[PDB]
Amino acid sequence: MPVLLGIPLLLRFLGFLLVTLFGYLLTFLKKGFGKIAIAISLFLALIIGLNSILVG
Amino acid sequence: YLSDISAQLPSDFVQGVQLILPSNALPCFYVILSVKAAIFIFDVKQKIVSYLDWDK
C-alpha cells in the first residue's frame, strides 16, 4: 500500500516513546511498593522493641 | 504551673511512713513513671512513619 518516504519512520518512532514512557511508570511503581515494605518493618520493630524494655 | 502549688510533708508524719514502708515500694513507683515515658516515645515515633503515606 504505497506511502510517502517518511511516514513509516514516524509510525515506528511514535511507539518508541510510548514504550520508553511506559517503562518509567513501571520503575516508579516498584519503588512505591518498597516504601510499604520499609513502613511495615518499622512498625513491627517498634513493637518488638517496647516488649524488651517492659519485660525488663 | 507546678512551681507555686508546691508543698512538703510535715516532719511529724515521717515516723509513721517509715514503719510500714516495704523495700520494693519506692522502686515500684518509679516503674509506673518509666512505663509512661516509654509509651510517649512509641506514640510519637508511630506517627512519623504514617507521614510516608502523604507522598502518593
Side-chain angles (χ1 to χ4, degrees):
Chain A
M1 188 200 72
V3 174
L4 289 168
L5 270 205
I7 308 289
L9 175 68
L10 176 63
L11 292 182
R12 278 189 262 109
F13 192 83
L14 265 184
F16 154 77
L17 294 182
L18 253 55
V19 302
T20 55
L21 287 167
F22 192 30
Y24 296 149
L25 293 176
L26 179 63
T27 320
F28 301 146
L29 175 68
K30 300 225 230 69
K31 280 199 169 91
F33 290 159
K35 180 222 289 172
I36 316 145
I38 286 168
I40 286 181
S41 178
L42 275 180
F43 148 77
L44 293 171
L46 288 176
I47 296 197
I48 294 168
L50 186 73
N51 183 252
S52 97
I53 280 139
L54 293 199
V55 80
Chain B
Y1 287 151
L2 290 170
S3 299
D4 193 23
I5 57 139
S6 178
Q8 307 275 282
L9 184 69
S11 286
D12 293 345
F13 288 94
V14 162
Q15 200 193 140
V17 192
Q18 286 196 328
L19 190 135
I20 297 304
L21 224 51
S23 296
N24 72 315
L26 261 178
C28 271
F29 175 52
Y30 291 158
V31 159
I32 310 277
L33 292 191
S34 181
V35 170
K36 295 259 199 46
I39 290 168
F40 160 83
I41 302 140
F42 174 80
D43 286 356
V44 170
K45 274 166 180 199
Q46 282 289 291
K47 201 187 161 174
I48 296 183
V49 182
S50 176
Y51 276 109
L52 272 176
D53 204 44
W54 278 48
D55 158 46
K56 63 182 182 179

